[PDB]
Subunit: 231 residues, 4 copies
């Protein structure tokens, strides 16, 4: 199967596959069962911001998720990613709904990777109706306001359940190379999660995988479109 | 056929299809017959640097080609590129040999595009043996020193004639959009041209084209791998 | 006196010192009497954006000023700036009021300069209460919302007349050097101009000058805090 | 006195004030007695490269120092720098000689800081004869090849003992702010250390301090121009 590293913004607690009993942000290394989590004061209807960073010297993957004036949650995990990930990757965003639902609207997304002794940076502050520099998978679409709807939304804006969708950047990324002195990446995205459900679900991830990654069978709902099971 | 905008570093004068009678840099808008040229004091065996820039407000495509301490040549052309190019493009480098030959060795290549009211930047200071973020066309390869050999070079380093090769960046680039306030791009590459021929040929280009661009039939030699004829 | 290059957003027509009879954007080379202007559909109470760019190869200073969904005005002028400006400069923003007034509120400001063969970039999306990386001149202050008020505003937000204020970046900028292949700069700022006056005044500039530049005597009002007279 | 955070490239072992018994790179938090060190295979006469990074989420200051094809040494230290440093800082490079000597030649220096919810980046690949964007302290000069000589070098290139010199960037840097979601910085410099001494000394640092920082009295030699004593 795919090799996966992800930062999950998990709005629904699936305690039966390892979630804490509350909304949380998590660092996922090849398993939906996060190696590290932090409690997420998830706000429906307000725009959030996530920042993710890593470098091969400090070897500490970190993420912070914030709502302006409201809250900020941070999670870190010490991991040598050059030991987990292949040399060439694609980076992306994923989102699911399940029994319960939410909009998983991406308003912006940027990413930088550096291979020091290669550089790649992209920034999207609007998404075009046919984004030729993105690989849209599952239900992911871009809409009339220029936003990226990772999961299905009806004509009036209502989120639908049992949705899975992902967007990967078109170009493979060279995230490590044996002659590199240091490899680093940074990622930021802003997101709007709306829901009429008392318990919204399921969440959004930023993720790095093998370049030929695709939505695994059975990855809906709590598996965030990333893993075929909860191992 | 393809839609082409290019800056050509033309080491061989083909006076019969419009070249001036000397090595020159040129700005090409949909024809190998440059809309503007400047005399190029082409230096065999020394590393050169080319800088190209454009923005949709000034509407002036410019290029400068230099050898440290030796020479610098500049050419500009006033053109609304949003009137020439499709909204989505790929960017690349091309090179040819013909009867006469030269190495067309790319040591580095960078590019930035901005869509203001989208950003894309890539930088290569070394090229890996299998560059998954590049579309290599024709004879283009990367070699053991980490350089990009656009045209065929033998085992010992000798350039071969009748070669054509191109390298495009993998991801389409969004170079204009009707809601943009301003669109801009910048490109830099460094290059080493070696030749045992008294009159080296044929040259190197940086070029922007339709995303599905490929080497046209009959584009070798003086056509720089860009055009199917000299119209 | 100072040596000045500026892009002026001139909200008040002073026809007696060379203004066209309407709000305009202008390119100023050592004189308030613009070398080039374009009609500016100036909008009171809406946030505007200005983009300015130049490179020493194309030698074309350009500016675009826009309100989202409303209007965009562009002005360009062909000028070799390395022939006007000293090698070391400071860059800044200026604004005035006079008999008539307006707020000259800077919401953001960024700038990049490149000296190719040096790089400097700064970006402000919020201004702190005591910006130690800015030289504030005249009436310029930063306020509680994190904005830069170039001209005097009363406690409730009312703009005052007979105000002059400027903000320069602290560090001198190396905008040309005789060994450079190409020198380039880019600048963006966003601005909010509010006024209860039927004819608001006087305007905002982005400007480059000798590093020891200061507000000239008698530069208020129509002189935009840049020039001691209307020569 | 000054508040100091530094990464030291310490070519001389002063075991009597806490150095390990070998050349080392070290992370210094308000004391020359490094909180963390790693053995440095210091190479005389070859160009080295140092990369330093930190972000306020991972809270891990890291540094890697390398010679191409030869060696690489890494040191990290977990520290909340927003708890050590004032909100406004200057960043710089320092170097000393003492009884023993070496050239402390800076060939390039770059730095980025980001204040997320401010950006500052500078890059020097050549240093001009009178760098107006640098505060040169002590013996620091720039020479005819465009390099930064932090410590005294004679007319022919011979390093002198009992030298101290520093170069700070002119503009204060805003490295933390109470409303920031995350603060980050990155720094790179390349350096050439030549010596006719069997045991070269004393070393080079990249350092962050109070904006009004100056060379303390008695900071020569093993104190690297940063501290007034070895507490
Ligand atoms: O969308 C949230 C969740 O909905 C389903 O799980 C349930 C949440 N509440 C329930 C109540 C009953 C059943 Br049966 C299920 Cl399967 C659930 C599944 O789709 C999960 O994958 C998902 O995490
Ligand atoms: O490589 C340089 C040139 O070589 C060929 O043209 C000639 C240059 N000198 C010649 C002499 C004879 C003939 Br026949 C040709 Cl076709 C040439 C052709 O391959 C040209 O496309 C190319 O520009
Ligand atoms: O603020 C707009 C203008 O106000 C003054 O000029 C006038 C605009 N309408 C007037 C009417 C009368 C007189 Br007297 C003046 Cl001086 C003006 C002067 O302060 C000008 O410098 C400025 O351009
Ligand atoms: O330059 C290297 C060192 O030279 C001096 O220390 C000595 C190194 N070998 C010695 C031998 C004798 C004496 Br006395 C001294 Cl003070 C030293 C002092 O200047 C030290 O600060 C410095 O670390
Ligand atoms: Ca879950
Ligand atoms: Ca030719
Ligand atoms: Ca006026
Ligand atoms: Ca020491
Ligand atoms: Mn979870
Ligand atoms: Mn030609
Ligand atoms: Mn005017
Ligand atoms: Mn030490």
């Amino acid at each position: 199967a795919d090799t996966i590293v992800a930062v999950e913004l998990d709005s629904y607690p699936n305690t039966d596959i390892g979630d804490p009993s509350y909304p949380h942000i998590g660092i996922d290394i090849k398993s939906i069962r996060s190696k590290a989590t932090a409690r997420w004061n998830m706000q429906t209807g307000k725009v959030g911001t996530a920042h993710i960073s890593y470098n091969s010297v400090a070897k500490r993957l970190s993420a912070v998720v914030s709502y302006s004036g409201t809250s900020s949650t941070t999670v870190s995990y010490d991991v040598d990613l050059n030991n987990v990930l292949p040399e060439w990757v694609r980076v992306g965003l994923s989102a699911t709904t399940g029994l319960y639902k939410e909009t998983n609207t991406i308003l912006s997304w940027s990413f930088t990777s550096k291979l020091k002794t290669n550089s790649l940076h992209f920034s999207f502050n609007q998404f075009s109706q046919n984004p030729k520099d993105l690989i849209l998978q599952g239900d992911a679409t871009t809409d009339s306001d220029g936003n990226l709807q990772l999961t299905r939304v009806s004509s009036d804006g209502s989120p639908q359940g049992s949705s899975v969708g992902r967007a990967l950047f078109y170009a493979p990324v060279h995230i490590w190379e044996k002659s590199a002195v240091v490899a680093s990446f940074d990622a930021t995205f802003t997101f709007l999660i709306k829901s009429p459900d008392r318990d919204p679900a399921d969440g959004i991830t930023f993720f790095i995988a093998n370049t030929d990654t695709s939505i695994p069978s059975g990855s809906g709902g709590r598996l965030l479109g990333l893993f075929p099971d909860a191992n």
